[PDB]
Amino acid sequence: WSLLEQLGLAGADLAAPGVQQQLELERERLRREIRKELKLKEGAENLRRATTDLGRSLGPVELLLRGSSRRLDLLHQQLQELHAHV
């Protein structure tokens, strides 16, 4: 799961200038990912409500909503992991 492990920075000197810049970039990316996921979720809730009024199955939408919250979770764990090395 570790974003540091994913980036091959596992046991690197994280205080170095290059690494510190790469991490700031990653934090920015993550922040943008979270915001996008947040809006997709709010939109998905609107769809869930729209589907409720159409009288159709909410299963697909509920699954997307869960996948979206699950993604937000991962994004928060990684963002948290990088806040420790700023």
Binding site: R31, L38, H76
Partner: protein
């Protein structure tokens, strides 16, 4: 793109009045498959109200009297309180001014409070009617919850069902707006 505004939310209320399911249904879009009495848990939710992005910290507390000692330590930097009771339990509504309000006001005076009526789906539940009938009772009315809200000087009063997800977003958007005025 700047970081989200941070605000911490604490939820309180009687045993099994639906506090955890409300937090999980909102933040994970999942209705907890098994009931597990809470001592203390915390989750993060993401929300946007009035064009403002907010990262909401959800602090889950215990309804049980057994853990009263722990609860006061969860109050310190709270931006908004979700004080709950269940619509299928008039006794849980009576504990609002009896136990929850006095405790919250003492540890968090000035902190916005949203009175929440949980399990709205049980109001018309026939089984709930027959059980409450025995105890010479009936499910909580919208007016009664709204009255109690006025009595404790709550920011607002909201009803919802974590089960059907009805009124869940409304509860959290109102709680966030209140926490923002801070």
């Amino acid at each position: 793109s700047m970081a989200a505004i941070r605000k911490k939310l604490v939820i309180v209320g009687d045993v099994a009045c639906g506090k955890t399911c409300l937090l999980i249904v909102f933040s994970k879009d999942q209705f907890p498959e098994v009931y597990v009495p809470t001592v203390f848990e915390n989750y993060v939710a993401d929300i946007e109200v009035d064009g403002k992005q907010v990262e909401l910290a959800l602090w889950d507390t215990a309804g049980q009297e057994d853990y009263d000692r722990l609860r006061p330590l969860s109050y310190p930097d709270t931006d908004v309180i979700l004080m709950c009771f269940s619509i299928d339990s008039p006794d849980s509504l009576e504990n609002i001014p009896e136990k929850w309000t006095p405790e919250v006001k003492h540890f968090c005076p000035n902190v916005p409070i949203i009175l929440v009526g949980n399990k709205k789906d049980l109001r018309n539940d026939e089984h709930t009617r027959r059980e409450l009938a025995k105890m010479k009772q009936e499910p909580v009315k919208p007016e009664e919850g709204r009255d109690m809200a006025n009595r404790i000087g709550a920011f607002g009063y909201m009803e919802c069902s974590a089960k059907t997800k009805d009124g869940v977003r409304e509860v959290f958007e109102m709680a966030t707006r209140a926490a923002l005025q801070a």
